[PDB]
Design a protein around this ligand. Structure first.
Ligand SMILES: *[C@@H]1O[C@H](CO)[C@@H](O[C@@H]2O[C@H](CO)[C@@H](O[C@@H]3O[C@H](CO[C@H]4O[C@H](CO)[C@@H](O)[C@H](O[C@H]5O[C@H](CO)[C@@H](O)[C@H](O)[C@@H]5O)[C@@H]4O)[C@@H](O)[C@H](O[C@H]4O[C@H](CO)[C@@H](O)[C@H](O)[C@@H]4O)[C@@H]3O)[C@H](O)[C@H]2NC(C)=O)[C@H](O)[C@H]1NC(C)=O
Ligand SMILES: *[C@@H]1O[C@H](CO[C@@H]2O[C@@H](C)[C@@H](O)[C@@H](O)[C@@H]2O)[C@@H](O[C@@H]2O[C@H](CO)[C@@H](O)[C@H](O)[C@H]2NC(C)=O)[C@H](O)[C@H]1NC(C)=O
Ligand SMILES: *[C@@H]1O[C@H](CO)[C@@H](O[C@@H]2O[C@H](CO)[C@@H](O)[C@H](O)[C@H]2NC(C)=O)[C@H](O)[C@H]1NC(C)=O
Ligand SMILES: *[C@@H]1O[C@H](CO)[C@@H](O[C@@H]2O[C@H](CO)[C@@H](O)[C@H](O)[C@H]2NC(C)=O)[C@H](O)[C@H]1NC(C)=O
Ligand SMILES: *[C@@H]1O[C@H](CO)[C@@H](O[C@@H]2O[C@H](CO)[C@@H](O)[C@H](O)[C@H]2NC(C)=O)[C@H](O)[C@H]1NC(C)=O
Ligand SMILES: *[C@@H]1O[C@H](CO)[C@@H](O)[C@H](O)[C@H]1NC(C)=O
Ligand SMILES: *[C@@H]1O[C@H](CO)[C@@H](O)[C@H](O)[C@H]1NC(C)=O
Ligand SMILES: *[C@@H]1O[C@H](CO)[C@@H](O)[C@H](O)[C@H]1NC(C)=O
Ligand SMILES: [Ca+2]
Ligand SMILES: [Ca+2]
Ligand SMILES: [Ca+2]
Ligand SMILES: [Mn+2]
Ligand SMILES: [Mn+2]
Ligand SMILES: [Mn+2]
Lengths: 61, 443, 240
């Protein structure tokens, strides 16, 4: 699983975009307050999600 | 009552050094430890590293001398020399901002110390505490918040050592307000564990058996847990239990948490009364009513109250909770209110022991900006069968004339020790605004 | 008719990337609305993010230039910056509001209380007159107050004096955040009424703050700006 926090002084309009992109490839999504987490995706998928999260400025664990 | 302030002994440090930010006793030849956050140490490449001064009590001029806790400067980055780059930043680290001594063990913390992780060039103020054990035979480093979690989402901005305490059995307690996006954290470790797991070769060191709180959901962000720490027996066993302050926890109302002491599991919560009152700026635990069970005191300096006329003035308040044999009630048993506008009343509390020697413990409450000339003031409240008294038994004010800069008198207190040996406890008050530290003795 | 003076305090932390358009629309709607009920008024605006010290911002040399992500550009942080003094020519106000850019920061709360204190105290520089004064405060985040600065090594309480140099706040690193009582006293002395145009999510906390500060109102910030506009109208019509 991948935890994408994005809880600092960053817009909520970027984090939401992540939830869109994750929903675009048809996989899991779980949202807590100002946090999202996606479960057990793949190797290439984890690379892609990490790249997008970095590009939008979110901290990805 | 019996606290002679005709001519207190006054210790003077270097100018422009915040001498007296934190004070403590040390009796392994009794002596007084004082801090100096902005002190010019002799270690190379360090600017205003800060230090501690061990003033040996007894000498006629009590000429304070510093303690060489660390002589090496900022450590070079490994494999960077293979120009060089500092792996840490000791400049303006505020070393000595918290000094606590138990037995022959000394603990001096540095909250503002920041280091650059090897993996990424980011910088984060982890903060470190140096622990000198068995007098000064060996001195170890303790950085419980310098873990592998790098950024602010981890323990990177934890600023451990911002508050610290020793328990009865020598267990070391630290509080890091900035951990997990300023959620706060309480870390605990015995000295023996630190010594066993000590390994200076590696910067990242995991102390086995360490107790700490875990990361909570994003609801509780910016709580500043661990802003102030204390100890006391509340559960009912022989193990001392932690007390932590959360000034901005519940919608900036703040609260105070009591912990299980052995598992760090929340036991009691005490909520604030007014928004943005900083309820939890300083906490203390002592047996005010002499029942044999520790009682809680919580300060809030920014609390405002309506004047009789109606104008809202900032005074500050102190809440006192008495621990009945059954349990500790969530309604403050007694509240003390300040009387000086912008006085910051209750920003530092300290138990004093049986100063009056009548069978009840007494308390001392500071006010950095009270008094006629806004120099500072300290109030001494007595105990009794009904609890804490409502009227200040004794008032202490600085002797020297006011300067053009605040004196911050009473911003750091410590008491409950028989410094001279006359059989009564003594008090020590910090005045770092003009770099002073005064000592009052019992009669 | 009564004369009126209004000053617009904008938040420009990185969390405003989703709200910048709403703030600009609110500015260009305050101007074109209050130029219809009073006919004699002056407005100006300012901006703020946070103090520039060790904990509140990233002190690494790379992030000082671009506190935001590497993809976006952003401008370096600034504690407070009075950009336009009070004036009546609306074209200047519109053109200056339309060119604002966002800035970065680390911690979620923003230090707007320094900006409020400086606006309240620095009278001649901003251009306050002996006339009913209004202050609209737009924010997407919480707020600091006294006691936070001790994290960054700042312990001197905010003295409440005017320290503006070259239309910029220069004593951010030297003074603590003002406590709530200090703001209450200064606003009550200067005869300034505050209207918080905060985002919906922070409605509760600011509403509680509305209890502490006398003669203050709280609306909501969105594309439909009508709430704070009607608050302005209500405040104007209640004068006597
Ligand atoms: C005093 O006041 C403080 C706060 O001011 C109180 O502390 C709060 O206590 C409450 C409960 O009383 C906590 O809320 C609950 O927390 C957990 C959530 O899981 C947590 O604990 C787990 C313990 O094993 C742990 O696994 C979790 O770790 C998670 O970490 C992250 C989450 O971000 C995630 O990535 C991991 O995978 C883990 O999931 C985490 O630490 C839980 O009990 C509750 O949520 C559950 O609620 C029900 C359960 O019946 C269920 O239906 C839900 O689906 C959900 O699972 C709830 O959130 C709160 O977190 C505490 N806050 C703080 C700051 O510590 C304290 O209790 C007060 N004391 C007193 C005496 O009143
Ligand atoms: C415990 O140590 C103190 C402090 O001295 C420290 O430890 C020394 C070994 C050395 O590293 C010093 O620089 C440290 O400050 C001893 O008290 C006196 O310390 C002063 C200097 O602060 C020194 O000049 C005196 O000689 C010390 N006193 C004596 C009697 O030697 C203290 O004595 C030590 N306790 C013991 C030995 O039981
Ligand atoms: C520590 O020492 C340094 C010099 O080694 C001091 O820096 C200078 O201090 C003098 C006064 O001694 C000032 O006039 C200069 O402007 C300072 N230069 C700087 C800051 O670049 C420093 O102030 C000392 N710190 C103390 C005494 O706390
Ligand atoms: C957070 O603080 C609020 C404000 O004090 C608390 O709400 C209070 O709740 C108590 C009972 O629990 C009531 O007596 C008060 O009147 C309430 N105050 C207000 C202003 O409504 C709230 O309980 C606190 N939350 C937690 C989790 O401690
Ligand atoms: C404080 O912590 C101790 C340590 O966990 C708790 O003692 C435990 O109590 C439970 C029963 O409640 C026993 O099953 C455990 O074996 C005990 N552990 C030890 C080592 O004594 C104690 O209950 C906690 N006190 C509280 C919750 O107030
Ligand atoms: C930001 O814009 C300026 C415009 O002058 C440009 O020079 C600079 O390279 C840009 N920086 C980034 C990080 O995009
Ligand atoms: C407002 O009144 C004050 C107080 O007398 C005075 O100093 C100031 O010049 C006056 N300003 C105007 C514009 O009349
Ligand atoms: C805003 O909402 C109100 C709701 O009554 C509506 O009348 C008004 O036309 C709306 N204005 C905008 C900005 O569209
Ligand atoms: Ca216990
Ligand atoms: Ca008791
Ligand atoms: Ca007594
Ligand atoms: Mn923001
Ligand atoms: Mn937003
Ligand atoms: Mn911020």
């Amino acid at each position: 699983e991948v935890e994408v926090h994005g809880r600092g002084d960053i817009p909520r309009s970027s984090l939401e975009l992540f939830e869109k992109v994750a929903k675009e490839l048809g996989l899991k999504v779980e949202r807590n307050h100002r946090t999202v987490t996606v479960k057990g995706v793949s190797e290439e998928q984890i690379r892609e999600l990490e790249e997008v999260a970095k590009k939008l400025g979110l901290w990805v664990l | 009552f019996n606290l002679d302030a005709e001519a207190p002994a006054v210790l003077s440090g270097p100018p422009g050094s915040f001498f007296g930010f934190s004070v403590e006793f040390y009796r392994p030849g009794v002596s007084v430890l004082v801090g100096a956050p902005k002190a010019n140490t002799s270690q190379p490449g360090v600017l205003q590293g800060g230090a501690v001064y061990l003033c040996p009590w007894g000498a006629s001029p009590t000429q304070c001398t510093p303690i060489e806790f660390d002589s090496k400067g900022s450590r070079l980055l490994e494999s960077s020399l293979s120009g060089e780059e500092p792996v840490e930043y000791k400049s303006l680290q505020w070393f000595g901002a918290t000094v606590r001594a138990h037995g022959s063990s000394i603990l001096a913390c540095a909250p503002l110390y920041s280091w650059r992780t090897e993996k990424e060039p980011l910088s984060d103020p982890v903060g470190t505490c140096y622990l000198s054990t068995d007098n000064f035979t060996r001195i170890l480093e303790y950085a419980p918040c310098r873990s592998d979690f790098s950024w602010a989402a981890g323990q990177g901005y934890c600023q451990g050592g911002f508050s610290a305490e020793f328990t009865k059995t020598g267990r070391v307690v630290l509080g890091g307000p900035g951990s997990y996006f300023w959620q706060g954290q309480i870390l605990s470790a015995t000295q023996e564990q630190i010594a066993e797991s000590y390994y200076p070769e590696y910067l990242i060191n995991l102390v086995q058996g360490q107790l700490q709180t875990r990361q909570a959901s994003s609801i509780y962000d910016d709580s500043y847990l661990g802003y102030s720490v204390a100890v006391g027996e509340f559960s009912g066993d022989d193990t001392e239990d932690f007390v932590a302050g959360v000034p901005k926890g519940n919608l900036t109302y703040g609260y105070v948490t009591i912990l299980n002491g052995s598992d760090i599991r929340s036991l009691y919560n005490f909520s604030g009364e007014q928004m943005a009152s900083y309820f939890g700026y300083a906490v203390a635990a002592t047996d005010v009513n002499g029942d044999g069970l520790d009682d809680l005191l919580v300060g809030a300096p920014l609390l405002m109250d309506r004047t009789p006329d109606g104008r809202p003035q900032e005074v500050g308040r102190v809440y006192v909770y008495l621990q009945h044999p059954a349990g500790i009630e969530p309604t403050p048993t007694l509240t003390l209110t300040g009387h000086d506008e912008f006085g910051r009343f209750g920003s530092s509390l300290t138990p004093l022991g049986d100063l009056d020697q009548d069978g009840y413990n007494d308390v001392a409450i500071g006010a950095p900006f009270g008094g006629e000339t806004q120099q500072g003031v300290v109030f001494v409240f007595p105990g009794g069968p009904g609890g804490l008294g409502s009227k200040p038994s004794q008032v202490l004010q600085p002797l020297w004339a006011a300067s053009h800069t605040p004196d911050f008198f009473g911003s750091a207190l410590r008491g409950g020790r028989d410094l001279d040996g006359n059989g009564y406890p003594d008090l020590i008050v910090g005045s770092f605004g003009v770099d002073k530290a005064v000592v009052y003795r019992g009669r | 008719d009564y004369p009126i003076d209004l000053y617009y305090l904008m938040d420009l932390s990185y969390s405003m990337k989703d709200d910048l358009e709403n703030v600009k629309s609110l500015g260009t709607d305050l101007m074109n609305e209050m130029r219809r009920i009073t006919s004699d008024f002056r407005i100006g605006f300012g901006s703020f993010v946070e103090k520039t010290v060790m904990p509140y911002i990233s002190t690494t040399p790379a992030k000082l230039r671009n506190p935001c992500t590497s993809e976006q550009n952003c401008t370096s942080p600034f504690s407070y910056k009075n950009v336009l003094s009070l004036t009546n020519k609306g074209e200047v106000f519109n053109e200056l509001v339309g060119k604002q850019r966002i800035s970065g920061n680390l911690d979620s709360p923003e230090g707007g209380f320094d900006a409020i204190m400086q606006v309240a105290v620095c009278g001649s520089l901003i251009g306050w007159r002996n006339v009913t004064r209004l202050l609209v405060f737009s924010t997407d985040a919480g707020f600091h107050f006294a006691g936070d600065g001790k994290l960054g090594g700042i312990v001197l309480p905010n003295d409440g004096q005017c320290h503006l140099e070259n239309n910029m706040y220069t004593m951010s690193h030297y003074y603590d955040y003002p406590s709530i009582a200090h703001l209450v006293q200064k606003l009550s002395e200067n005869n300034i009424q505050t209207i918080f145009a905060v985002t919906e999510e922070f409605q509760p906390v600011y509403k509680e703050l509305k209890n502490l500060i006398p003669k203050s109102a709280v609306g909501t910030l969105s594309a439909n700006s009508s709430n704070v506009i009607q608050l302005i109208i209500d405040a104007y019509n209640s004068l006597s």
